[PDB]
Each structure stands twice: as structure tokens, then as C-alpha cells.
PDB file of C-alpha atoms and ligand atoms in Angstrom:
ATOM      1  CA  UNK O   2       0.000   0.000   0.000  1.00 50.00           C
ATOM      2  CA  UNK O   3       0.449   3.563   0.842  1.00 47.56           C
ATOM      3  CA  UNK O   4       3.958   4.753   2.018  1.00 47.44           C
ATOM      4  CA  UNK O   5       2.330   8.313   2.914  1.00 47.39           C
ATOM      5  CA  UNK O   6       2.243   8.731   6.722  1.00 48.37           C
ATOM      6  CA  UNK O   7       0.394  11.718   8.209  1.00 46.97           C
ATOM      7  CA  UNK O   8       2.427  12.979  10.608  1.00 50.24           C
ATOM      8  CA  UNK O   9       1.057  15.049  14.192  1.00 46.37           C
ATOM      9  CA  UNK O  10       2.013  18.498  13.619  1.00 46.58           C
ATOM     10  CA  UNK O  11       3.751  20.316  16.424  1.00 47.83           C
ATOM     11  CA  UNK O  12       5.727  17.330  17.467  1.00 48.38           C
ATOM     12  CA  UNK O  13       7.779  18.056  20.369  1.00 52.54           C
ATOM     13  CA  UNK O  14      10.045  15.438  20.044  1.00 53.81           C
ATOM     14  CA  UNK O  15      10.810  17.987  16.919  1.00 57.80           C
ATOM     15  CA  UNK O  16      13.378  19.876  18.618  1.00 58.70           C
ATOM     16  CA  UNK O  17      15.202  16.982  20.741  1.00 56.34           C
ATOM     17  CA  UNK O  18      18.574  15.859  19.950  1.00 57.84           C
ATOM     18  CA  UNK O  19      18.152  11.966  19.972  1.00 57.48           C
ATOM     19  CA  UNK O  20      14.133  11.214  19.577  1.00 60.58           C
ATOM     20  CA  UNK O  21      15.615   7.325  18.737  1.00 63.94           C
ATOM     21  CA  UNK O  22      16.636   7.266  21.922  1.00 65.57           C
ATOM     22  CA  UNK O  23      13.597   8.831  23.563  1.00 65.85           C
ATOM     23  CA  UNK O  24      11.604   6.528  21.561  1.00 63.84           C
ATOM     24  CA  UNK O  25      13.257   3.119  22.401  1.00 68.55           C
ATOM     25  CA  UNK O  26      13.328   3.991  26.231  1.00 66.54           C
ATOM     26  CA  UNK O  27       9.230   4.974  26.175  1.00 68.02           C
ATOM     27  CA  UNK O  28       8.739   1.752  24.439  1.00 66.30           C
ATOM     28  CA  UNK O  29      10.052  -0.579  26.685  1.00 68.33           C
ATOM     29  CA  UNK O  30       8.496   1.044  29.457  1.00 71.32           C
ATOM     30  CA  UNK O  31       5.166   1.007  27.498  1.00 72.07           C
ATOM     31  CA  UNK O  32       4.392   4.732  27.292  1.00 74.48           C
ATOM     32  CA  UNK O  33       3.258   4.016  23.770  1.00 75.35           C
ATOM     33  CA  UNK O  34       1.745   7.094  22.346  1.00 75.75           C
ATOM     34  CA  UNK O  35       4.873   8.892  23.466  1.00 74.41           C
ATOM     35  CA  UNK O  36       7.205   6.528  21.524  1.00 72.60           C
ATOM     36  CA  UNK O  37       5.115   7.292  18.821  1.00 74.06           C
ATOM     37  CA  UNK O  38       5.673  11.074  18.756  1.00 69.98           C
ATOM     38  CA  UNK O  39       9.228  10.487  19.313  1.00 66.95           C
ATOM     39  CA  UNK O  40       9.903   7.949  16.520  1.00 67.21           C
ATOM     40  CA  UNK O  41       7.540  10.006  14.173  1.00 67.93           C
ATOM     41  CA  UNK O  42      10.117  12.552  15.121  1.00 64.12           C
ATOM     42  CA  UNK O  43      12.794  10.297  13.661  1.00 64.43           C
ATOM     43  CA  UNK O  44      10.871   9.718  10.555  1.00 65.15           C
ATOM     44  CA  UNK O  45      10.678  13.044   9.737  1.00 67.31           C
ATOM     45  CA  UNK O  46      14.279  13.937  10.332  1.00 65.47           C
ATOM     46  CA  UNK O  47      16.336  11.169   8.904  1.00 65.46           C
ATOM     47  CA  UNK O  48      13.868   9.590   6.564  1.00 60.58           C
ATOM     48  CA  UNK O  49      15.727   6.870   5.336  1.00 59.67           C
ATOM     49  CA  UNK O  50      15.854   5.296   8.836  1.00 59.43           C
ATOM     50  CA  UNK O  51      14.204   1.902   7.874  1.00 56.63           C
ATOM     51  CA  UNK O  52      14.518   1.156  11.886  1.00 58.93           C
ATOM     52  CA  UNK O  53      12.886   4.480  12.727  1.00 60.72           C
ATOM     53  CA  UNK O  54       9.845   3.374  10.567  1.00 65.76           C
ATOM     54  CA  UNK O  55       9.569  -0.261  11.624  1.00 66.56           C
ATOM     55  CA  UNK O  56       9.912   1.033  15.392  1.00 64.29           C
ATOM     56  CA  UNK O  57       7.080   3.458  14.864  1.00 66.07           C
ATOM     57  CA  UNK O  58       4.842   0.637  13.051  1.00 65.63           C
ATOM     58  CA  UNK O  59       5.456  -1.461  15.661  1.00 62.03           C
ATOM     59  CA  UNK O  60       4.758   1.082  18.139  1.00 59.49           C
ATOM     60  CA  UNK O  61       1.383   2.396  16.460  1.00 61.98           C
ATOM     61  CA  UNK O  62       0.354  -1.909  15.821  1.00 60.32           C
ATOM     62  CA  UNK O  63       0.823  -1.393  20.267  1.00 58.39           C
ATOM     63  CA  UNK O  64      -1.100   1.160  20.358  1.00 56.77           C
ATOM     64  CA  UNK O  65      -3.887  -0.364  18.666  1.00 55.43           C
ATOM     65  CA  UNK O  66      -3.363   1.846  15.677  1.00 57.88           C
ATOM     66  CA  UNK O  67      -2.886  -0.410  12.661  1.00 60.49           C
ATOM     67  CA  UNK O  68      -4.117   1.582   9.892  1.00 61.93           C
ATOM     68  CA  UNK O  69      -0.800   3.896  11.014  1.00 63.43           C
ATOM     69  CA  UNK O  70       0.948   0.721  11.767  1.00 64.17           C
ATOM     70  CA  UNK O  71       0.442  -0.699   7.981  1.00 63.03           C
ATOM     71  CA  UNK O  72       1.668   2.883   6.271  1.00 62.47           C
ATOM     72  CA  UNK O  73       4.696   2.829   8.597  1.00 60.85           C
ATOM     73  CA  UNK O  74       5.641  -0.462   8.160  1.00 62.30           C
ATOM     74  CA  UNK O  75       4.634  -0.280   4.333  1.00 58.65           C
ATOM     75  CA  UNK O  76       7.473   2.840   4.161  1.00 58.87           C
ATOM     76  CA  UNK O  77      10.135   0.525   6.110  1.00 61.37           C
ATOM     77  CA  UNK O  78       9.312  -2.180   3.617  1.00 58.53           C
ATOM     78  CA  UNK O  79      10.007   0.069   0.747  1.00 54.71           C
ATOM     79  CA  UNK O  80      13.397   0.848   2.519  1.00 53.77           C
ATOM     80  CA  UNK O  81      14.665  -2.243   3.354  1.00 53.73           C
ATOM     81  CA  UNK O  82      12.668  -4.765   1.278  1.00 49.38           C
ATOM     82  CA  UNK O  83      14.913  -8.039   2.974  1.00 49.40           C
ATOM     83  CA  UNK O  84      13.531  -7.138   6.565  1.00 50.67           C
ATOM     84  CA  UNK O  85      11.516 -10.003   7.302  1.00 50.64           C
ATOM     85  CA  UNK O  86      10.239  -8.847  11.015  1.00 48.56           C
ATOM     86  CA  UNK O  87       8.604  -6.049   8.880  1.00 46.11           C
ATOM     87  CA  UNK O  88       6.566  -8.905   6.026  1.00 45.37           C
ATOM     88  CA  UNK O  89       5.126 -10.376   9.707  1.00 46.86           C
ATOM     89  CA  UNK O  90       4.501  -7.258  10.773  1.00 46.75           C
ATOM     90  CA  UNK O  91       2.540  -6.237   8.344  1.00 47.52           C
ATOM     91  CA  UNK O  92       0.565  -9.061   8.030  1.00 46.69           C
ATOM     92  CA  UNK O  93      -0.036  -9.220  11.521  1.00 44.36           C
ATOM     93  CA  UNK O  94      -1.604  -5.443  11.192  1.00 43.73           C
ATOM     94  CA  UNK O  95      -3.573  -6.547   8.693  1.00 41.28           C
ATOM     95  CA  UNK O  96      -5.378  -9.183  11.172  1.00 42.81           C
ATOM     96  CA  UNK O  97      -5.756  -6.882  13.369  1.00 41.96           C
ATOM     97  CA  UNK O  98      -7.373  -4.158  11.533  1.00 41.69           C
ATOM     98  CA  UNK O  99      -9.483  -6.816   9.923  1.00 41.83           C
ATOM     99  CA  UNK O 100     -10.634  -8.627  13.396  1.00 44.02           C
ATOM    100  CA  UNK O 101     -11.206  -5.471  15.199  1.00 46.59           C
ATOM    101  CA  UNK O 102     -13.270  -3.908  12.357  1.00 47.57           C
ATOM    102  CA  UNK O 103     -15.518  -6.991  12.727  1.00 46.42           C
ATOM    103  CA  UNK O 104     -16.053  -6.844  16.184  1.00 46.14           C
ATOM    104  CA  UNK O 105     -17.277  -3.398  16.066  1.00 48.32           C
ATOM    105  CA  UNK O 106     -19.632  -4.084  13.011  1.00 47.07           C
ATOM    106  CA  UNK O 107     -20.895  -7.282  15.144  1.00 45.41           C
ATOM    107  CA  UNK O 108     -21.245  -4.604  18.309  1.00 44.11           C
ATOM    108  CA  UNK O 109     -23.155  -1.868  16.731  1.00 43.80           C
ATOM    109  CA  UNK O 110     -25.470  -4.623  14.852  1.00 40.05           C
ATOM    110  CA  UNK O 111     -26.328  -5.630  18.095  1.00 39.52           C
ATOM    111  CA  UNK O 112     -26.645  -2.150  19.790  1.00 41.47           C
ATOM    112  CA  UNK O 113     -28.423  -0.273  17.140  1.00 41.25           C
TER     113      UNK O 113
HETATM  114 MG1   MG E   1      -4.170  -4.593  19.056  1.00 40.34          MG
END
């Protein structure tokens, strides 16, 4: 699919010397939509970082996000086209998107 992320405007991560960094640490202490600014930080500001795009698709598939997940990890695809963590990743996004979808749809045909 589609490479084209939409990046949050007035990121502060934006003006912060090592948003990797930043990003990694929130991560593994599961502040998710933090690691997420941060690493959309990184995006922007080196983007040929393949890592920097497969850490923020991972990030946004943890933060239940996978539409963002699948154009992140779509753009580290395109960059690295050998990382294999990123095909399972993807597809794994997919599943989500696709099982959550239906158990909304199956919600609201019940509630409504
Ligand atoms: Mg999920």
C-alpha cells in the first residue's frame, strides 16, 4: 500500500537531539503514544531510517493503531525490502485491523 504517513504536527520530540533514543526507552516502558511522537520525530528527520519506521509501526500496531501501523511499516518495507520482522509485521496489522473492524460491526449490529 500507501507509504504516505500523516504525521502530528507540532511534534515536540521535533526539537530533541536523539528522539531514537527517547523513543526506544518509552517503548520498553510502554508509554506508547509517546514513543510514537518520538519515533515520528525520527521519521521526519532522517527519513531513510528503515529502523525508525519499523519502530514506529510497531509502536502504532501497540497502540492499537494499525491503519498507522500498515503505512509505517509499508514505508520501512520500501526501505529495506529483505527485513523479514517487517513482512510479519505487516501481516499481523492486517489481522488486526481486519478482526477489530468486525467486532465493532458485530457490536453496533447488536446495539443499534
Ligand atoms: Mg491490538
Amino acid at each position: 500500500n500507501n507509504t504516505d504517513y500523516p504525521f502530528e504536527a507540532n511534534n515536540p520530540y521535533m526539537y530533541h537531539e536523539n528522539p531514537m533514543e527517547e523513543g526506544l526507552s518509552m517503548l520498553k516502558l510502554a508509554n506508547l503514544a509517546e514513543a510514537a511522537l518520538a519515533f515520528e520525530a525520527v521519521c521526519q528527520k532522517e527519513p531513510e531510517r528503515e529502523e525508525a519506521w519499523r519502530s514506529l509501526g510497531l509502536t502504532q500496531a501497540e497502540n492499537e493503531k494499525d491503519g498507522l501501523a500498515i503505512i509505517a511499516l509499508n514505508h520501512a518495507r520500501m526501505l529495506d525490502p529483505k527485513d523479514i520482522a517487517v513482512h510479519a509485521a505487516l501481516a499481523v496489522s492486517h489481522t488486526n485491523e481486519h478482526n477489530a473492524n468486525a467486532a465493532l460491526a458485530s457490536l453496533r449490529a447488536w446495539l443499534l
